[PDB]
Amino acid sequence: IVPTRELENVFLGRCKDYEITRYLDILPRVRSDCSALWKDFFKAFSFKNPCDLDLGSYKDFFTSAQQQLPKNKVMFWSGVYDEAHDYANTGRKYITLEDTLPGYMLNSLVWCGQRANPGFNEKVCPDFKTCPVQARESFWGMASSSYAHSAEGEVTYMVDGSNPKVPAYRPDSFFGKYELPNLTNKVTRVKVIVLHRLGEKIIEKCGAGSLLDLEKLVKAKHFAFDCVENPRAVLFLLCSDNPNARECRLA
Amino acid sequence: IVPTRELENVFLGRCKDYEITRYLDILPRVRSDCSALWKDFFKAFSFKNPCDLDLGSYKDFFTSAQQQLPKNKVMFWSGVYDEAHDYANTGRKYITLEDTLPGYMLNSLVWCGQRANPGFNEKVCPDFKTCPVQARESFWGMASSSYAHSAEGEVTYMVDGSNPKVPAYRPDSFFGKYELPNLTNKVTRVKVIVLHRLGEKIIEKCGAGSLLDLEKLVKAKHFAFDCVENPRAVLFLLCSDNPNARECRLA
Ligand SMILES: NC(=O)c1ccc[n+]([C@@H]2O[C@H](COP(=O)([O-])OP(=O)(O)OC[C@H]3O[C@@H](n4cnc5c(N)nc(F)nc54)[C@H](O)[C@@H]3O)[C@@H](O)[C@H]2O)c1
Ligand SMILES: Nc1nc(F)nc2c1ncn2[C@@H]1O[C@H](COP(=O)(O)OP(=O)(O)OC[C@H]2OC[C@H](O)[C@@H]2O)[C@@H](O)[C@H]1O
Ligand SMILES: NC(=O)c1cccnc1
């Protein structure tokens, strides 16, 4: 893959944009300057081989960047990026990882270290499936970890019950690796939302299969559990993109 | 009412981020670099009294910042900012002025000039309703003119039909002053979408009142014209937010 151009400029620009104007009524301000943020972020990967990284490489950066999160509002998702963020509504109904400072600064960006000056690669970045797992998941794994760790009260989980090749809940998702195991006794309940893509064969159902596994894990953390399939407000979102579906017919 | 802090840094940060990462498949890059853009912007109001502006003050800036816009995808809106932007879907279905470079950089921001150094006011910005209309509307009126002037093919206009106090179409709106009068022969059609808020009395309908005036006005310029109220895809977005309304009763 081709690395993002003028990485420092984009980082510092999104950082200043967010600081002054984004989520002011929804998430608290970070306590560090954007230059200090850049400095911890850069020294995490710079002057090293693109696969030298591990789960600790970005710890100082995420310590500098972490935000206290609104009780009851935190959302996780697997397999339904577009639907979860549409439904979250840019922080107004739920908060996602992407609404917090570090997700919003690096969302979609591409970067990597090298050993010669200037210590990063402007030309090429390795396909990351070529690195050991602790290295290919250094950044986004620690991100999901801090984030889950800060969740309080109710949390929400959106998933896909229409995928014949991917279970609604997998222990090897980012949610299963990093999120679920990191939630504290400050969390009280897990509310799952199963998406049935319209026009398509239903594959997972509440309490059966991987959702029944998930249920048992959640109760084992002494957390409450509920699960619903196409709740009306979410169904209406889907229907808007496919107003003809049989599921969408009105009285 | 307080002015945006670190205006220049916010402006430049937003400009750089948009340049490198935003709308890359949806809209073209402008030729002019960020510091050249800043120049043109700042000379418009700097070192003059706050109400010492007119429609031609920001002219060089908008000249520099204007993008060609993709055919059939331009949308206008009155009275329904949230609903129109949700439905336009960040450029994926329709483009709005807030998706273009100059609208993206200045959206939500607050600034004004002053005669003394630094040439702009960091303390307060006169309740712009204090100023002659050509000063109060110098920036966003010129933004709207330039945007409308660039539109091709079909264009769409989303309006409020439940406001007893404010008609669907008004000659004194930004659409009536700046946008409709500036559409060129490159535009072939104007498609109106009338929004009826759930559970609010319906005030305006296609073919009556101000919408009738709008139809004739649009017939004069030799565009086609259609109009529709609460079409399904828009209606479902509304129900998503108020699933229990009578209009959202499922069969
Ligand atoms: N914002 C994020 O990017 C982000 C990333 C990971 C986890 N999160 C947290 O964990 C859950 C989403 O991961 P999930 O439960 O695994 O659900 P998914 O739909 O499978 O998403 C993986 C897809 O993202 C793409 N991806 C991006 N970067 C990478 C990366 N370094 N490495 C890899 F492998 N994939 C990446 C990749 O193409 C892959 O196809 C959410 O609760 C979220 O808070 C957010
Ligand atoms: N000088 C000003 N500067 C700024 F930033 N905002 C202003 C100013 N004056 C009034 N406003 C606010 O700006 C809003 C004017 O909105 P509506 O009335 O809802 O629709 P319309 O008038 O047609 O103007 C929206 C249409 O103009 C171009 C755009 O692409 C779309 O086609 C009002 O809600 C009002 O609170
Ligand atoms: N975004 C705005 O404030 C705005 C105001 C007037 C016209 N167009 C946009």
Side-chain angles (χ1 to χ4, degrees):
Chain A
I1 188 141
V2 182
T4 310
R5 289 185 294 140
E6 321 191 20
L7 176 65
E8 198 177 349
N9 287 340
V10 175
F11 177 101
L12 294 171
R14 286 184 173 190
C15 186
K16 178 63 63 185
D17 186 10
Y18 191 106
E19 178 200 8
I20 295 304
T21 70
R22 301 316 178 156
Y23 310 93
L24 296 175
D25 298 308
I26 306 190
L27 293 155
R29 293 308 80 185
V30 156
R31 284 151 89 87
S32 305
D33 199 334
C34 289
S35 296
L37 288 165
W38 172 256
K39 195 196 281 66
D40 284 333
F41 165 76
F42 193 65
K43 65 85 164 328
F45 61 98
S46 71
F47 289 94
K48 306 176 317 182
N49 236 275
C51 301
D52 252 5
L53 305 188
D54 57 45
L55 238 316
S57 301
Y58 294 89
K59 283 211 64 214
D60 290 3
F61 172 67
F62 283 104
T63 293
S64 291
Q66 202 36 67
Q67 285 159 294
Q68 183 178 235
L69 305 179
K71 285 185 157 170
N72 289 314
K73 297 312 179 100
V74 154
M75 158 154 266
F76 316 98
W77 49 276
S78 313
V80 294
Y81 180 94
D82 281 350
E83 295 94 353
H85 295 84
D86 282 354
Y87 188 57
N89 199 200
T90 300
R92 268 115 91 256
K93 175 172 259 149
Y94 298 97
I95 284 291
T96 72
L97 178 59
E98 293 70 28
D99 296 298
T100 63
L101 180 71
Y104 169 100
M105 291 187 305
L106 283 318
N107 189 0
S108 279
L109 300 195
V110 175
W111 67 99
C112 64
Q114 76 190 29
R115 284 164 130 73
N117 300 156
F120 64 105
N121 207 151
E122 324 166 87
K123 286 317 138 193
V124 75
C125 283
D127 167 42
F128 282 97
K129 278 171 45 193
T130 85
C131 294
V133 72
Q134 73 280 3
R136 80 218 187 207
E137 295 173 355
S138 185
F139 188 85
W140 289 107
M142 184 63 188
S144 306
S145 287
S146 311
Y147 169 79
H149 177 85
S150 292
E152 309 198 314
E154 306 183 330
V155 307
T156 305
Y157 190 32
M158 195 173 313
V159 300
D160 188 343
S162 272
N163 185 345
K165 299 213 76 138
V166 185
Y169 162 84
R170 291 184 294 125
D172 350 76
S173 54
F174 275 66
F175 173 84
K177 279 161 172 147
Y178 296 117
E179 290 181 317
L180 184 58
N182 276 315
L183 304 166
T184 72
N185 69 356
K186 294 179 155 85
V187 173
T188 54
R189 176 179 298 278
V190 171
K191 301 161 75 66
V192 174
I193 302 187
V194 194
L195 217 103
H196 291 147
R197 301 191 180 266
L198 308 179
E200 264 146 8
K201 194 179 158 292
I202 299 182
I203 309 282
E204 303 262 19
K205 272 189 147 306
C206 288
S210 71
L211 286 171
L212 184 66
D213 297 324
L214 181 58
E215 172 158 11
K216 295 183 162 155
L217 287 147
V218 165
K219 294 185 169 184
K221 319 258 279 171
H222 316 244
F223 293 158
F225 184 87
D226 56 43
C227 177
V228 302
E229 317 172 355
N230 286 2
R232 295 178 68 175
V234 166
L235 168 62
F236 285 134
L237 227 58
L238 304 191
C239 281
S240 61
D241 270 326
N242 193 187
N244 293 322
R246 182 200 89 267
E247 297 92 322
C248 306
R249 303 147 305 186
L250 296 163
Chain B
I1 181 164
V2 187
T4 306
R5 300 175 300 129
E6 314 192 30
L7 179 59
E8 187 183 345
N9 288 335
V10 169
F11 177 102
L12 291 174
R14 277 188 172 197
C15 179
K16 172 63 58 174
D17 169 33
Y18 187 108
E19 195 198 351
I20 307 294
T21 72
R22 307 298 176 167
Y23 300 98
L24 288 175
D25 41 334
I26 295 160
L27 285 155
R29 310 304 92 187
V30 314
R31 303 187 305 285
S32 193
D33 73 29
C34 288
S35 47
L37 288 165
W38 171 255
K39 262 254 180 36
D40 284 327
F41 173 76
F42 194 68
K43 79 181 167 203
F45 61 93
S46 75
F47 292 93
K48 288 156 33 180
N49 283 330
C51 284
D52 193 12
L53 285 203
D54 53 35
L55 259 274
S57 311
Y58 290 92
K59 199 240 261 287
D60 284 4
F61 176 66
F62 284 109
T63 291
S64 295
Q66 189 61 55
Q67 286 152 302
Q68 284 174 237
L69 310 174
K71 257 201 69 143
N72 309 322
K73 307 208 341 178
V74 166
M75 155 181 282
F76 311 102
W77 63 261
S78 307
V80 294
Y81 184 103
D82 301 334
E83 303 86 353
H85 287 86
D86 282 332
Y87 184 62
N89 209 182
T90 329
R92 295 170 244 156
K93 184 189 307 274
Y94 296 101
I95 294 285
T96 66
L97 167 66
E98 297 70 34
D99 294 310
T100 61
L101 179 67
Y104 184 96
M105 299 186 290
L106 285 317
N107 201 25
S108 271
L109 298 197
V110 166
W111 70 98
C112 53
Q114 75 177 23
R115 287 194 311 106
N117 220 268
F120 68 109
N121 199 345
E122 290 183 297
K123 308 283 201 49
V124 55
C125 276
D127 339 307
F128 261 35
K129 8 258 87 288
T130 42
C131 278
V133 70
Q134 80 266 1
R136 98 177 43 142
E137 281 180 2
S138 174
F139 182 91
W140 295 101
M142 190 49 176
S144 299
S145 303
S146 191
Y147 173 71
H149 185 80
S150 293
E152 318 165 42
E154 290 178 321
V155 293
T156 300
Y157 177 52
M158 191 165 324
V159 292
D160 193 344
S162 333
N163 191 338
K165 276 229 223 69
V166 185
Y169 163 76
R170 271 178 290 142
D172 279 302
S173 64
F174 275 62
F175 182 75
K177 296 186 208 225
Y178 297 118
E179 298 175 329
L180 179 66
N182 287 314
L183 295 178
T184 59
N185 62 349
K186 314 275 69 91
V187 166
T188 57
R189 178 188 296 260
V190 159
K191 301 183 78 76
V192 186
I193 298 165
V194 174
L195 203 143
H196 296 133
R197 306 179 183 279
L198 311 183
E200 275 201 350
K201 173 165 149 265
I202 282 157
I203 310 294
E204 291 263 47
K205 313 211 53 146
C206 298
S210 68
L211 302 167
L212 229 214
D213 299 335
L214 187 48
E215 189 172 322
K216 282 186 33 173
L217 234 205
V218 169
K219 278 210 212 215
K221 324 201 64 182
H222 311 280
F223 311 138
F225 171 95
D226 49 55
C227 182
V228 75
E229 308 139 338
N230 279 3
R232 276 182 159 242
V234 162
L235 177 57
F236 289 130
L237 282 184
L238 300 187
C239 297
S240 185
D241 277 345
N242 189 177
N244 222 51
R246 336 170 271 352
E247 304 94 328
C248 311
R249 235 176 284 195
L250 287 170

